[PDB]
Curated annotation (Swiss-Prot):
One of its GO terms (molecular function) is ubiquitin protein ligase binding. The gene is EGFR. The lineage of its organism: Eukaryota, Metazoa, Chordata, Craniata, Vertebrata. Phosphorylated on Tyr residues in response to EGF. Dephosphorylation by PTPRJ prevents endocytosis and stabilizes the receptor at the plasma membrane. Dephosphorylated by PTPN1 and PTPN2. It comes from Homo sapiens (Human). Changing P4A: Reduced phosphorylation. This is Epidermal growth factor receptor.
Length: 314
């Protein structure tokens, strides 16, 4: 009927990994930067250790274990990998460290060095990961530039599967990101891969504007009515009509009319072959971002036996 999920859930010993510092904290919990040193493997894997705040309750453990399930069931270069879980009183998710943080902060902090090549390459990469989730019958339900994290300035991955559901999905109440949601999702609680396309459209808009807040100043309760009238996000200044047309197509009333992720990969790839024809940025091509071919690129985070999780297969 539905294929058995043969994913392996790795249980990791608390003694095998070490917390270095807090990267962030909030509603999600507390995310720590760490190092995982397996068995007698002679390797040190940079990791992100996630735990829900501090307070241990059966409800909090269920949500984090559901997230572990979804994450252990995915394997794509553009989707964050779950290395394992630690069965402490609290319960920790051990995922691959994305050293440069989220894309939203990245574009905000580095706008003066982000060229059109990087921007269109990010769009291709996000569509590839999103298309993988689609193949795996998975609806993200929370795609935004805050949930697209940076491994290297040239390699981004989809993260935060707290809302992700394995297959239209029928949800309930709570806290919803309205300004990233499709109309059917706001009015009828309907989530499809095509509602993820709407979220992709807003994510692209976030990148193209260099981290602008969508519908800034407008209260979330007004959004539903604004979209119903025909109002959308403006054309970012760096955007040509070619790129904005793509964004607009992601924001159509008819879900079947919106592009498919496999088409978005194609469209953005064509554009990424000639970035200056699709994005007009002052100073483009003279811009510089760190790459693994830079001095102290890896030293900027002991070493010697440090291996990235993408190169640590088991
Ligand atoms: C909650 N959230 N938001 C974006 C990502 C996440 S996450 O589910 O904690 N996933 C992951 C995975 C790897 N890495 N590496 C670094 C981070 C990180 O800086 N996270 C915060 C602090 C939440 C922005 C990370 N976060």
């Amino acid at each position: 009927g539905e294929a058995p999920n043969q994913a392996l859930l790795r249980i990791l010993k608390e003694t095998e990994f070490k917390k270095i510092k807090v990267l962030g904290s909030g509603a999600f919990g507390t995310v720590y930067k760490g190092l995982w040193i397996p068995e007698g493997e002679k390797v040190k894997i940079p990791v992100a250790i996630k735990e829900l705040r501090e307070a241990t309750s059966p409800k909090a453990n269920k949500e984090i274990l559901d997230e572990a399930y979804v994450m252990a069931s995915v394997d794509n270069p553009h989707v964050c990998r779950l290395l394992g879980i630690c069965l402490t009183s609290t319960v920790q998710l051990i995922m691959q460290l994305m050293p440069f943080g989220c894309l939203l902060d990245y574009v905000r902090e580095h706008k003066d060095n982000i060229g059109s090549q990087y921007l269109l390459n990010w769009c291709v990469q996000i569509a590839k990961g999103m298309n993988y989730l689609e193949d795996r019958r998975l609806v993200h339900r929370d795609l935004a530039a805050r949930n697209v994290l940076v491994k290297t300035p040239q390699h981004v991955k989809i993260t935060d599967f707290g809302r992700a559901k394995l297959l239209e999905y029928h949800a309930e109440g709570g806290k919803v990101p309205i300004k990233w949601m499709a109309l059917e999702s706001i009015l009828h609680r309907i989530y499809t891969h095509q509602s993820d396309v709407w979220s992709y459209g807003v994510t692209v808009w976030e990148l193209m504007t260099f981290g602008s807040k969508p519908y800034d100043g407008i209260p979330a309760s007004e959004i539903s009515s604004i979209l119903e009238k025909g109002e959308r996000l403006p054309q970012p200044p760096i955007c040509t009509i070619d790129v904005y047309m793509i964004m607009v197509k992601c924001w159509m009333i008819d879900a079947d009319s919106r592009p498919k992720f496999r088409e978005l990969i194609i469209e953005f790839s064509k554009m990424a072959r000639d970035p200056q024809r699709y994005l007009v940025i002052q100073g483009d091509e003279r811009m510089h971002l760190p790459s693994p071919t830079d001095s102290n690129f890896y030293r900027a985070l002991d070493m010697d036996d440090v291996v990235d999780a993408d190169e640590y297969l088991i």
